[PDB]
């Protein structure tokens, strides 16, 4: 029913030529006026894709490249993760936890969620490193998902579940990091998750390096604040089943932990998850938060 009428695609001109752009968020709202995504993640994504593909055809428009689509599925996946996480802390009644969907480091460096005291220590570290004949640099990135535990960060609005997608609750789920900017105590993060389409070599390596970068950063903070009990775990979540070969490889030791006999041995990536269904998201978070 009336597709030449969908808004999941838009025409626009650039240099007098007409181009077509997909509108991922309108696609979501249009297909989720009464429920949130359930069952197979890949199935919900294929549906959204085909939906946009049907709308393009009914409008007799130029068809978007595989690229445009591969990118849109990512934006949809990001929204799915964010929404599920938002409803997870609600149904699990985790009043002291925030599971935030983070954008890329250039959009909003997650480090900005840290309070002033913590950021100054990291800034002092950076300045220290960059002050050497041969320049060394502290380069960090953003985990796709952050699990934070700090009761005072919880607003009552966060406790209302999302039963259907709207421009408003989607925007709120994707800009949650803005509410806690500069408010997080360094030891309030409990974990970070790197979400990958698959464990293809390059993507598996990204999990490994990111885990080393973030965990060592936290280890540095533990020495600055002299808090041996502070803990930060880093996880990986693949959209494809995980093979033993990849699982084996994701057992690699965090490099900063093999130079001091007093540090507990630990992997760069504490564990790897396979997300097929939305329930797999809840299961992953269950293992991450506790038990």
* Binding segment (CB under 5 A) for Cl ion, from list 24-32, 133-141, 201-209, 255-263: 24-32
CB of 98 to Cl ion, least distance (A): 19
- Positive or negative, the CA dihedral 279, 281, 287, 289 is negative
195 labelled ligand-binding: yes
> From the list 1, 60, 259, 290, which residue makes contact with its own copies (rule: CB under 8 A)?
259
Tokens representing 25 are 């968020």
CB of 71 to its own copies, least distance (A): 13
- Positive or negative, the CA dihedral 99, 155, 74, 208 is negative
Tokens representing 283 are 């299961």
**Rounded-to-integer distance, Cα 93 and Cα 73, Å:** 30
> From the list 90, 94, 154, 219, which residue makes contact with its own copies (rule: CB under 8 A)?
219
Q: Does 116 bind its own copies (CB under 8 A)?
A: no
Q: Which residues contact 199 (CB under 8 A, 6 or more apart)?
A: 207, 236, 238, 240, 242, 243, 246, 250, 272
The partner in contact with residue 208, picked from Cl ion, its own copies, none with C-beta cut-offs of 5 to 8 angstroms by kind, is: its own copies
The partner in contact with residue 106, picked from its own copies, Cl ion, none with C-beta cut-offs of 5 to 8 angstroms by kind, is: none
The partner in contact with residue 26, picked from its own copies, Cl ion, none with C-beta cut-offs of 5 to 8 angstroms by kind, is: Cl ion
199 labelled ligand-binding: no
Query: In which order are the strands placed within the sheet that holds 97-101?
Result: 97-101, 145-149, 189-196, 233-238, 271-274
Give 68 or 205: the residue with its C-beta nearer to its own copies: 205
- Positive or negative, the CA dihedral 156, 160, 166, 171 is positive
CB of 214 to its own copies, least distance (A): 10
Q: Does 185 bind its own copies (CB under 8 A)?
A: no
CB 141 within 8 A of CB 105: yes
Q: Does 128 bind its own copies (CB under 8 A)?
A: yes
**Rounded-to-integer distance, Cα 212 and Cα 271, Å:** 13
Q: Does 121 bind its own copies (CB under 8 A)?
A: yes
Q: Does 65 bind its own copies (CB under 8 A)?
A: no
Q: Does 283 bind Cl ion (CB under 5 A)?
A: no
Q: Does 202 bind its own copies (CB under 8 A)?
A: yes
Task: List residues bridging with 11 in a β-sheet.
Answer: 20
> From the list 106, 132, 290, 291, which residue makes contact with its own copies (rule: CB under 8 A)?
132
Task: List residues bridging with 14 in a β-sheet.
Answer: 17
Q: Name the nearest CA neighbour of 65 among 77, 76, 75, 52.
A: 52
Q: Which residues are annotated as a binding site for Ca(2+)?
A: 144, 195
């Amino acid at each position: 029913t009336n597709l030449t009428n969908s808004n999941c695609v838009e025409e626009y001109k650039e240099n007098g030529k007409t181009k077509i752009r997909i509108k991922p968020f309108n696609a979501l709202i249009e297909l989720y006026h009464h429920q949130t995504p359930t069952g197979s993640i890949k199935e919900n994504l294929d549906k959204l894709e085909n939906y946009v593909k049907d709308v393009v055809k009914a409008k007799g428009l130029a068809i978007p490249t595989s690229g445009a689509f591969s990118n849109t599925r990512g934006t949809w996946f990001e929204v799915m993760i964010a929404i599920q996480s938002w409803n997870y802390r609600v149904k699990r009644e985790l009043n002291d936890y925030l599971i935030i969907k983070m954008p890329n480091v250039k959009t909003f460096d997650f480090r900005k969620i840290f309070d002033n005291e913590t950021r100054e220590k990291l800034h002092q570290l950076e300045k220290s490193l960059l002050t050497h004949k041969q320049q060394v640099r502290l380069i960090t990135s953003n985990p796709d998902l952050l699990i934070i535990r700090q009761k005072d960060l919880i607003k009552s609005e966060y406790n209302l579940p999302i039963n259907k997608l709207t421009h408003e609750n989607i925007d709120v789920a994707l800009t949650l990091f803005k509410d806690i900017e500069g408010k997080c105590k360094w030891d309030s993060l409990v974990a970070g998750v790197g979400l990958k389409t698959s464990l293809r070599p390059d993507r598996r390596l990204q999990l490994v390096h990111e885990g080393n970068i973030l965990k060592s950063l936290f280890a540095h903070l533990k020495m600055r604040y002299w808090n041996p009990k502070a803990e930060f775990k880093y996880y990986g979540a693949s959209s494809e089943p995980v093979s033993k070969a990849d699982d084996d490889a994701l057992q690699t030791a965090a490099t900063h932990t093999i130079v001091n006999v007093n540090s507990t041995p630990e992997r760069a990536v504490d564990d790897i998850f396979s997300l097929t269904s939305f329930e797999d998201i809840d299961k992953m978070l269950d293992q991450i938060i506790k038990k």
